[PDB]
């Protein structure tokens, strides 16, 4: 309803392949009082 929210969390890991059998909440980080009816998205590329 016109609010764009973004949560986050960071952790140190050593296993290489998959997500670990661990639990950790995602504390809220940023809120936006703006609304666009997004349908698609794409992750950027670096060099």
């Amino acid at each position: 309803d016109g609010y764009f929210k973004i949560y986050s969390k960071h952790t140190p890991i050593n296993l290489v392949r998959g997500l670990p059998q661990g639990f950790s909440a995602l504390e809220p980080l940023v809120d936006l009082p703006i609304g666009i009816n997004i349908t698609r998205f794409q992750t950027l590329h670096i060099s």
């Binding site: 016109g2 609010y3 009082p33 703006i34 609304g35």
Partner: protein
Amino acid sequence: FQPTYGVGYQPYRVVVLSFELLHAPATVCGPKKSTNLVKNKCVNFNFNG
């Protein structure tokens, strides 16, 4: 516009404020009232609604 121009003919600055009511969340609003904190007395409070 000249300094010797009479009233009604001098350059007057004019700023029009247009207000609109889109369904999106309202952003610009007014200030608070603050008052003062009082303790150890049965009172009523309005902490952010």
